C-alpha cells in the first residue's frame, strides 16, 4: 500500500482482548477442581457413601427401633471438550523476511492463546450446564 | 437510544431467525411508541431518570482503551465520556436528579511554533508589513457527575459558544409525526351499537339524533380548541376529475392471466323481430347450458370478513368506488349479435351511477 | 348519482353519501436531544491553516482554510442520541384540505365549463385555492394572506375507505394503506418487497386473517394507489407537500446487509422533505438542507390523536379530565395513543 | 490431546481434553427458578387447525364432494395445503412472505355440549373434560387407565 | 461470542377457552342492572347465544 | 391425550422431581407455524403445568362491548350480563401484557 | 486498520468443532474543511504603505 510518513501513534495503543480467568469467577467456589492428568485413560470410577441414621429411643406400644446404616454408590459420569485451529500453508512455509517471521510468530501465538483461553472459559460453561440439568425447581 | 437499548438485550449474538426478528421488531415498536419524549412526561418522579441514564451510559460499550495522558478527576479517577445538554436540561438534571463528584477537572493542554507561520505569511503576500505583522495538565472548572457506576462530564455549552452569534445551536432538531384519523366511519354491527347506560345523552324530541351516522369529526388544535372536519372539506379533493382516470388501470389489468366465464351478465343482444314468446323461450333453453360455473355476482350474501378474505378473487377486480370491473368479450360491439361469438375474454368496467351500485359488503 | 358534481351537491347539502374517508396529517415538533459519546469516539486529524489572497470591493479578503479529518474509531457504536423534551410545537394542529386542482396533467372532462364551475365551487369552503385567473407557465402558487395566526398551517390529504371498516383497527397505531410494508419484514428472498406491497392472494402480514382493510388504496392500481403513488407522479406539478406521499412510495432499498443494520442506519435524522419558512407547507424546497429526524415514518405507521364524533361527548362534565367513553350509541371517541399523551394540556 | 489433518489450503488441528464431573450430594445442592419475562416469542394470535394435512382416513365416496369440501375450507383459513395436492409428499403448506409478529400459535377445537358447567372453565381445568394423567405414582400402575377411561 | 448463553430458558404454557357455550338455567341469565346495556331494536341481541 | 409412561425409581418423589425439569423440545422453533418437533432438536425447554396435564384460561371476552370500562383505567369487571360471559384471567400472566 | 479477535467457547456434543474468527475492518478517512470571512478596508493598506 502507498507509503507515507506513517509515524507510530507515539503513545496511542490498542489491546486485542480481555482474558478470562476461572478462579476469578465467583462460581469457582461451587466446584472443587483437582488435577488428574491420567483422566483420558481411566476406565470407571465410583465414590463411597457410608451414613449412620440417628435413632432416639421411644418407650411405649411401638416396635423396637434398631440402629441401621445406609450405603450409597455413584457413577463417574464424564464428558469431553474439543476445539479447532487452522494454519495456512504460507505461514508454516515462513516458519519452516525476518519481519514476516516476527509478525507470524505473533499471529500463531494470538490464535493459540485464543484457543486455550476458550477451552478454559468453556469449562465454566460446562459446569453451569450440568448444575442446571441437576437442579429441580 | 430508543432503538439501540433493547438491541443489546434481546439480541443474543445476531443472525436471529425470522421469528426472533419479528418479536424484536414488535418490541421496538412498543418501546418507541412509549419512551420517546420520556423526560418531559415523566419529570415528577426523579428516580427513573437516573435509572435509565445509568442504562444508556452502560449500554453503548467502550471504544479502544488508549490512555497515556487524559482528562481525569482531582481524586485521579479517569474520566470516560461526555454528555451534552442545554441550559434547561442542565438545570433540571443538576437540581436533584444527579449528584456531583467533582467541581473541576484535570485536563491535558498539549497534543505553537507552527501556528505563528500564518501571521508571518499573512502580510507577506499583501504588503511590506511582514516585519510588522508579528512585531502536563491543568485544573479547569467543569461539571463532573456519576451516573450508574461511571463518571462523565455533563455540560450545556451555550454561553461559552453559540451565544450572540448568527449560527443556531444544534440538538434542537425537529420531529415529524404522522397522525391518522378516521372521519366519516360507521359501525355496521348493531351488536356493537350498544349503550353504556340508558340515559347518557338524550334530548326532548321523540327520535334520538344520534342513531344517524356521523357527518364529521372534532379535535383539538395547537392550543386545544375544538375544531371541525366535515365532508365539505373532503369535497376539495374527492370532487376532482382524478376519480375518472381508470384508463391506465384498464391497461394494467388487461395484462394478467384471465380465465373464461359465463357472459350472462355482460352480453347485450338485439330484438329478433318476434312476439317475445319465442324469444324468451329460446333464451330459456339457451340459458340452460350457458352456465358453465357459479356466476361471480351471486354471493352478495357474504359479509365483510370472508369478502375481504384473500380467497375471494373479486378483490383484485375491486379497485375504485366509482366503477365495477368485470370480464367481457373482446372485439365485440355492444349491442352484439345474439349468438355470443368466440372471443378472447378481456376486462372491462362499468359506472357506479348510484351509490347503491356498490356491493352490499361495503 | 355518484358523479363528482352530484357528489358535490350532496357534500355541500349536508347529506351523507355511502362513502367514508381516512385522513392523514404530518405535523412537526420542536424538541431537544440528549447525547453521550464515550471517551475516544472520534479521531480528529488537524492539518495546516492557509491564507487565501482574494480582492474585496472596498478592500481585501484574507480567507483562512484548514483541512480537518474525522474518523470514527469505534468497532461498534460509540455514541447515542435521544429526543429529550418539548419546545413549543413549530406547527399547528392544522385542518386544511389538500385541494387536488393544484395538479395539471390528468385527463380532463368533456366540457370545460363544468370543470370551471367545479373549481369555483371548491374555491369556497377552503383556506387554500389556486388564484382564479389561472396562472399559466408556473407553479400555481396560492395567493398569500395577512399575518399567520397560530403557526405554519398543516395540510391533510384524504383517502377513500368503506363506511364499515373495523373501528378497532384505528383505536391503536395503524397504517392508512390498510396493510403493512417495508423491507423490515424479510429474511428469505430479495424481490419479495413487491409481494409485501401488493400481493392480495396472501393475507396481510400485520393481520394474518384478511387481505387488507381498504381494498381501495391497497391494490397495484387501486384508486388510492393510482391517486397517491410517488412513481405515478400525478401531483408532481402541485407545489404543496404531501403528508401521504411517503406512505405509498415503495422505498428503494439494497439487500447487501441484513435488516437490522440498515434499520439502525436509516433510523437517524434524514434530510427533511418539508418546507419550513413557508406558511402553507410546500413541497421540499430545492436546495434546502436542514436536519430533521423522522421516527415512525420509516415504520410505515401512523398515530391516532385525540378525537370524538360529538363535542359534549368529547369531555366529561366533571370540571377536570376529558371524556373517557368509547362509543355511546353509534358515535365514537378515540383515546389518544400517540406518545403525545401526558403533554399538550387541554 | 492433539489430532491433526491437512486442510483445504493448509493444515487443521483439533485439541481435545476429557472431563469428569460427579455429584457429591446426599440430597440436592442446586435449585433453579424462573424470575422475569421478555417479549414473547410466539404471539397471542388465532390459527384454525386443518386436518387435511394428514391422509389415511376413510374418505368420502364421491371424490367431487371431498375436493369441494377441501376447496371451500381453504377459504377462511390462512394455512392450507398446496392446491394441486401432490401425491406421496410432505403436504407442506405454501410458505408465505416475511412474517410479522413471531410464531403463529396453532389452535385446535374440541366438540362439546352447548351447555356445560361454565364454572369448570372459571379456573384451572382439563380439556379432556376428565381430570387424568399420571398424577404421581399410585400403589398399582393399572389404576391410571381406569382413571382416564 | 456466537454461543447462546444459558439461563434464557423458555417455558411452554397451554391455554383453554370456551367457544359458544350457553347457560342452561333461566335464573342464570340475570343482569346486574336493568337499564345498563341496550340497543335501538325492541328485542335485545343479548339473549342471542 | 396420550397416557404417560413410568419406568423405575419406585419413589414418586424423585420422579416428580426429575421429569419436572426441562424436557427436550416438543414443538418446532424457527418455523412460523409450529410444525412437529423437528428431528434432532436439542433445546432445554421447561414445561410447568404440562406434565401436570393442565392449561389456563386467559382473559377472554364474548363481546368487546363489555371487555373494557370507560373510565380511562381498569378493564371490564362484569361477569355475566344477560347471556354473554367473561373469564377473568386466572393464568400466571395476569401482571403483564398492557392494552 | 483494525484487527479484532473474537473469543469462543470450547464445546462438545453432536456439534463439530468451530473455528476461531478474525475480522479485519478498515475505514477510509473522511476529509473536510471550514473557513470564515475576514475583510480589510483599503485605507488600511494605504496606511501600511
Amino acid at each position: 500500500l502507498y507509503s507515507a510518513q506513517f509515524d507510530i501513534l507515539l503513545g496511542t495503543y490498542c489491546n486485542t482482548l480481555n482474558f478470562v480467568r476461572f478462579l476469578e469467577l465467583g462460581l469457582s467456589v461451587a466446584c472443587i477442581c483437582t488435577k488428574f492428568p491420567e483422566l483420558a485413560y481411566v476406565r470407571d470410577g465410583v465414590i463411597q457413601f457410608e451414613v449412620q441414621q440417628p435413632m432416639i429411643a421411644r418407650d411405649g406400644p411401638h416396635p423396637v427401633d434398631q440402629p441401621v446404616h445406609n450405603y450409597m454408590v455413584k457413577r463417574i459420569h464424564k464428558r469431553s471438550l474439543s476445539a479447532a485451529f487452522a494454519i495456512a500453508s504460507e505461514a508454516l512455509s515462513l516458519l519452516s523476511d525476518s519481519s514476516l517471521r516476527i509478525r507470524a510468530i505473533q499471529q500463531m501465538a494470538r490464535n493459540l492463546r485464543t484457543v486455550l483461553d476458550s477451552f478454559e472459559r468453556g469449562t465454566a460453561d460446562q459446569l453451569l450446564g450440568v448444575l442446571l440439568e441437576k437442579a429441580p425447581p | 437510544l430508543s432503538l439501540l437499548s433493547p438491541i443489546n438485550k434481546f439480541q443474543p449474538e445476531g443472525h436471529l431467525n425470522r421469528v426472533a426478528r419479528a418479536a424484536l421488531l414488535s418490541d421496538l415498536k412498543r418501546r418507541v411508541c412509549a419512551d420517546m419524549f420520556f423526560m418531559t412526561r415523566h419529570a415528577r418522579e426523579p428516580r427513573l431518570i437516573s435509572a435509565y441514564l445509568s442504562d444508556m451510559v452502560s449500554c453503548t460499550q467502550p471504544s479502544v482503551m488508549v490512555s497515556r495522558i487524559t482528562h481525569t478527576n482531582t481524586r485521579g479517577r479517569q474520566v470516560d465520556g461526555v454528555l451534552v445538554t442545554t441550559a434547561t436540561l442542565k438545570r433540571q438534571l443538576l437540581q436533584g436528579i444527579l449528584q456531583i463528584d467533582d467541581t473541576a477537572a484535570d485536563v491535558p493542554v498539549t497534543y505553537v511554533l507552527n501556528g505563528a507561520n500564518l501571521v508571518t505569511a499573512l502580510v507577506m503576500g499583501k504588503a511590506v508589513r511582514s516585519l510588522d505583522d508579528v512585531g502536563v495538565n491543568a485544573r479547569v472548572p467543569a461539571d463532573l457527575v456519576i451516573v450508574g457506576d461511571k463518571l462523565v462530564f455533563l455540560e450545556a455549552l451555550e454561553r461559552r459558544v453559540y451565544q450572540a452569534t448568527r449560527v443556531a445551536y444544534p440538538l434542537i432538531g425537529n420531529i415529524d409525526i404522522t397522525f391518522i384519523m378516521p372521519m366519516g366511519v360507521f359501525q355496521a354491527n348493531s351488536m356493537d351499537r350498544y349503550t353504556r347506560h340508558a340515559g347518557d345523552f338524550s334530548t326532548v324530541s321523540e327520535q334520538d339524533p344520534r342513531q344517524f351516522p356521523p357527518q364529521g369529526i372534532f379535535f383539538y388544535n395547537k392550543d386545544g380548541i375544538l375544531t371541525q372536519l366535515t365532508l365539505r372539506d373532503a369535497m376539495g379533493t374527492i370532487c376532482h376529475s382524478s376519480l375518472l382516470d381508470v384508463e391506465a388501470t384498464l391497461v394494467a389489468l388487461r395484462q394478467q392471466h384471465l380465465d373464461r366465464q359465463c357472459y350472462f351478465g355482460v352480453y347485450v343482444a338485439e330484438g329478433t323481430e318476434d312476439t317475445l314468446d319465442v324469444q324468451m323461450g329460446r333464451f330459456m333453453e339457451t340459458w340452460a347450458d350457458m352456465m358453465p360455473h357459479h356466476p361471480h355476482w351471486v354471493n352478495e350474501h357474504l359479509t365483510i370478513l370472508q369478502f375481504i378474505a384473500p380467497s375471494n378473487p373479486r378483490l383484485r377486480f375491486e379497485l375504485n368506488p366509482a366503477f365495477d370491473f368485470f370480464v367481457a368479450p373482446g372485439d365485440v360491439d355492444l349491442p352484439g349479435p345474439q349468438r355470443p361469438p368466440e372471443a378472447m375474454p378481456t376486462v372491462n368496467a362499468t359506472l357506479r351511477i348510484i351509490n347503491g351500485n356498490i356491493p352490499v359488503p361495503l | 348519482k355518484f358523479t363528482p358534481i352530484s357528489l358535490t351537491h350532496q357534500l355541500r347539502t349536508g347529506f351523507h353519501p355511502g362513502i367514508a374517508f381516512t385522513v392523514v396529517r404530518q405535523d412537526r415538533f420542536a424538541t431537544e436531544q440528549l447525547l453521550y459519546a464515550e471517551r475516544a469516539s472520534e479521531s480528529y486529524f488537524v492539518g495546516q491553516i492557509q491564507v487565501h489572497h482574494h480582492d474585496a470591493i472596498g478592500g481585501v479578503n484574507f480567507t483562512l482554510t484548514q483541512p480537518r479529518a474525522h474518523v470514527d474509531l469505534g468497532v461498534g457504536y460509540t455514541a447515542v442520541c435521544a429526543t429529550a423534551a418539548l419546545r413549543c410545537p413549530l406547527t399547528d394542529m392544522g385542518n386544511t384540505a389538500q385541494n387536488l386542482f393544484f395538479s395539471r396533467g390528468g385527463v380532463p372532462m368533456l366540457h370545460d365549463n363544468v370543470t370551471e364551475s367545479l373549481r369555483r365551487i371548491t374555491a369556497s369552503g377552503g383556506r387554500l385555492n389556486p388564484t382564479e385567473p389561472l396562472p399559466i407557465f408556473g407553479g400555481l402558487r396560492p395567493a398569500t394572506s395577512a399575518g399567520i395566526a397560530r403557526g405554519q398551517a398543516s395540510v391533510c390529504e384524504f383517502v377513500a375507505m368503506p363506511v364499515s371498516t373495523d373501528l378497532q383497527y384505528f383505536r391503536t397505531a395503524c397504517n392508512p394503506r390498510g396493510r403493512a410494508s417495508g423491507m423490515l419484514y424479510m429474511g428469505d428472498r430479495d424481490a419479495d418487497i413487491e409481494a409485501i406491497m401488493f400481493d392480495h392472494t396472501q393475507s396481510d402480514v400485520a393481520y394474518t386473517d384478511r387481505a387488507t382493510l381498504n381494498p381501495w388504496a391497497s391494490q397495484k392500481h387501486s384508486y388510492g394507489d393510482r391517486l397517491y403513488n410517488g412513481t405515478y407522479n400525478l401531483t408532481g406539478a402541485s407545489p404543496i407537500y404531501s403528508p401521504c406521499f411517503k406512505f405509498f412510495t415503495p422505498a428503494e432499498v439494497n439487500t447487501n446487509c441484513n435488516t437490522l443494520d440498515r434499520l439502525l442506519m436509516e433510523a437517524k435524522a434524514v434530510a427533511s422533505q418539508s418546507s419550513t419558512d413557508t406558511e402553507y407547507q410546500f413541497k421540499r424546497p430545492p436546495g434546502s438542507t436542514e436536519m430533521t429526524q423522522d421516527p415512525c415514518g420509516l415504520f410505515q405507521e401512523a398515530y391516532p390523536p385525540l378525537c370524538s364524533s360529538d363535542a359534549a361527548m368529547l369531555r366529561t362534565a366533571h370540571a377536570g379530565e376529558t371524556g373517557a367513553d368509547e362509543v355511546h350509541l353509534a358515535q365514537y371517541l378515540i383515546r389518544d395513543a400517540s406518545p403525545l399523551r401526558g403533554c399538550l394540556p387541554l
Side-chain angles (χ1 to χ4, degrees), chain B residues 71-107:
Chain B
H71 310 77
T72 181
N73 186 291
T74 303
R75 307 285 60 70
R77 184 144 157 261
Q78 181 263 328
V79 306
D80 48 304
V82 175
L83 188 153
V84 297
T85 61
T86 64
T88 61
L89 277 296
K90 180 63 66 68
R91 64 181 50 260
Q92 44 94 30
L93 294 174
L94 183 62
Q95 188 274 331
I97 301 299
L98 276 297
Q99 62 84 30
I100 297 299
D101 58 355
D102 191 354
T103 61
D106 270 337
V107 54

Side-chain angles (χ1 to χ4, degrees), chain B residues 136-152:
Chain B
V136 293
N137 286 336
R139 288 264 166 219
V140 173
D143 291 331
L144 283 72
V145 65
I146 303 299
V147 56
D149 57 353
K150 285 293 321 303
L151 197 157
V152 65

Side-chain angles (χ1 to χ4, degrees), chain B residues 22 36 53 73 75 111 142 154 182 193-194 227 231 244 266-267 294-295 307 324 353:
Chain B
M36 162 295 287
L53 276 295
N73 186 291
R75 307 285 60 70
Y111 60 102
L154 188 153
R193 305 197 283 107
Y194 62 97
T227 186
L231 294 174
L244 317 179
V266 302
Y267 204 110
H294 177 73
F307 178 45
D324 309 71
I353 297 89

Side-chain angles (χ1 to χ4, degrees), chain B residues 1 3-4 18 21 25 29 33 36-37 39-41 57 60-67 70 78-85 89 121 125 152 171-188 193-196 200-201 208 210-212 214-223 227-229 231 233-245 248-249 252 308 310 318-322 352-355 358 362, chain C residues 1-2 4 8 11 14-16 20-29 31-40 53 62 73 76-78 80-81 83-87 89 91-95 97-101 107 109 118 122 150 158 161-164 170 174 176 184-188 200-201 210-211 215-216 219 221-223 226 259 292-294 299 301-311 313-315 327-332 339 341 346:
Chain B
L1 173 54
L3 282 72
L4 191 140
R18 324 286 299 291
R21 292 187 299 112
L25 188 153
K29 297 296 289 183
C33 174
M36 162 295 287
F37 270 47
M39 283 73 74
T40 302
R41 59 201 312 180
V57 63
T60 180
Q61 70 270 15
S63 184
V64 297
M65 282 75 75
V66 57
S67 282
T70 179
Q78 181 263 328
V79 306
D80 48 304
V82 175
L83 188 153
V84 297
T85 61
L89 277 296
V152 65
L171 294 174
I172 306 101
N174 319 122
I175 301 299
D176 274 356
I177 301 299
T178 67
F179 292 89
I180 185 167
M181 172 46 77
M183 183 278 288
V185 298
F186 175 74
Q187 64 182 357
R193 305 197 283 107
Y194 62 97
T195 185
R196 190 87 193 208
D200 291 331
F201 283 359
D208 186 2
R210 289 306 171 285
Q211 176 61 258
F212 316 140
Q215 285 263 49
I217 206 70
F218 300 151
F219 84 80
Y220 283 164
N221 51 35
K222 168 63 153 304
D223 313 328
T227 186
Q228 183 62 255
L229 279 293
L231 294 174
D233 291 331
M235 161 285 278
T237 178
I238 193 66
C239 288
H240 186 238
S241 65
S242 293
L243 281 293
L244 317 179
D245 198 359
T249 300
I308 62 170
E318 188 66 30
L319 295 174
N320 188 358
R352 284 170 171 169
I353 297 89
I354 296 288
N355 65 8
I358 193 66
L362 302 103
Chain C
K1 297 204 292 295
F2 181 77
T8 313
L11 294 175
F15 176 79
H16 186 273
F21 301 78
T22 177
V23 311
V24 65
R25 156 162 43 99
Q26 180 33 62
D27 274 16
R28 288 163 54 170
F29 268 117
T31 187
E32 293 83 3
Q33 183 144 70
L34 264 291
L35 190 153
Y36 173 73
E38 294 180 354
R39 180 186 66 195
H53 184 278
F62 276 45
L73 72 165
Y77 294 97
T78 60
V80 56
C81 67
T83 66
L86 294 174
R87 174 91 41 71
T91 190
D92 60 356
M93 281 315 88
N95 53 2
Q98 204 282 359
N99 188 358
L100 183 62
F101 281 66
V107 287
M109 295 298 102
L118 183 63
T122 188
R150 263 170 265 126
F158 292 165
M161 61 79 71
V163 298
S164 167
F170 277 92
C174 65
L184 288 77
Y185 294 98
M186 202 264 297
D188 51 324
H200 304 274
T201 61
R210 62 175 182 266
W216 276 325
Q219 286 68 13
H221 285 76
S222 68
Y223 162 49
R226 176 79 262 174
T259 180
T292 68
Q293 188 154 314
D294 197 1
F299 269 43
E301 187 73 338
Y303 292 165
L306 172 62
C307 63
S308 174
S309 176
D310 290 330
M313 185 64 72
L314 184 140
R315 293 148 297 98
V327 291
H328 159 263
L329 183 63
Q331 295 72 14
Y332 62 111
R341 190 194 303 134
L346 319 178

